[PDB]
Ligand binder design. Structure first.
Ligand SMILES: [Zn+2]
Lengths: 226, 226
């Protein structure tokens, strides 16, 4: 909410989620919607355009605006919104995002080590001198996975990490408040550097999967308390 | 272009890409920009909001609008735009997207077969009676990969496929114009069904990688002529 546009956007998303405006149906006319929400038509139009780009709506000239099935039309951009809309399902959403990070990274880290080890090493070296605090590590960690994704030579993995950033770093800012989380991560970045230097193979997959499991354990034990 | 908003959006993206409005700098004032493009301020605002959601810009109240480094702020949503902006790099972009589909699917197809084989089988069965035409196969193929992504039980893989849809199906509509491409795909869906039924393991990874390589060969030989 806050600003009129912010309030309108949140109102419409909440209305779609709670089925006031069910996915699969037509959105109410602009005049009725603006009057219902309490914003000007120009403010509403700007919000509708934003929602359309995020996949919540489909807008077409000379045609009623449709409320989409966002599970079919939205991308990673809605992760943060999903976390806000369904608090009870947040634990599972987080586990799912961490699993995606682990498994997709096995692919691009292996490729990065083979195709651009110099870039991979530069990325991993950023862990040096990192501040021993949650916010610093949350950003460092995200930057390392995103950096390795681009270091693969296939920027599409980078675009995927870009979409994951919002919720991924949010998790990180809480996860890395745990000193052990920071320690395990540093050990991981250091091991990855060694594997890259040695031109290792199977060890990369096993090392990344192991990190996902161990970091996942630390997170789960933190999550269980909340 | 076409509509005023369409023209304005294309103009701004082209200007960012060609460094008229360099990433890392501030976007020209709205009054100047609307006058330069030839659209109303309201049309411009709607376009700016759309561009911001796609990651091209960062808009903040009481602060100049920044032109972002889209490689850092944009997600899969920009794939189609990238293809239109850099024709010479399209062949590589396509190869990269196909590689992502292949490698990420090894993960979610394996998971789907283990966690929800019934859902995986339902998805694969949609290949039955499929029309022997490019458009039909492009949609079927995308629906099968997206379907298996959701069948994994981790919807985030589905969100990734959602973001890939635009460019992925565009490739498909051309790729599947080749009768052999359609045949190889049907053989693949049928083999996947058999592997799911048998509760196969290593065969899944090997089969998916093989399909990526063989379909990639067919596509490359088509691409080379263009
Ligand atoms: Zn997106």
């Amino acid at each position: 909410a806050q600003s009129p546009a912010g309030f309108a956007e949140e109102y419409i998303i909440e209305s779609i989620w709670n089925n006031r405006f069910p996915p699969g149906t037509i959105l109410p006319a602009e005049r009725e919607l603006s009057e219902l929400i309490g914003v000007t038509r120009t403010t509403l139009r700007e919000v509708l355009q934003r929602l359309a780009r995020d996949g919540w709506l489909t807008i077409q000239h000379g045609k009623p605006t449709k409320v989409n099935n966002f599970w079919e039309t939205s991308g990673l951009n809605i992760l943060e919104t999903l976390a806000r809309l369904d608090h009870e399902s947040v634990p599972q959403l987080i586990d799912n995002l961490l699993s995606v990070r682990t498994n997709i990274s096995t692919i691009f880290i292996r490729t990065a080590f083979r195709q651009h080890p110099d870039k991979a090493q530069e990325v991993l070296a950023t862990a040096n001198e990192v501040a021993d605090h949650a916010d610093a590590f949350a950003e460092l960690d995200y930057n390392i996975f995103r950096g390795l994704a681009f270091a693969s030579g296939n920027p599409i993995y980078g675009l995927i990490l870009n979409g994951m950033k919002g919720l991924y770093t949010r998790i990180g800012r809480h996860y890395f408040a745990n000193p052990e989380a920071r320690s395990l991560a540093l050990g991981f970045y250091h091991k990855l550097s060694a594997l890259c230097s040695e031109g290792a193979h199977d060890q990369v997959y096993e090392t990344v999967r192991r990190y996902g499991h161990e970091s996942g354990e630390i997170w789960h034990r933190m999550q269980k308390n909340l």
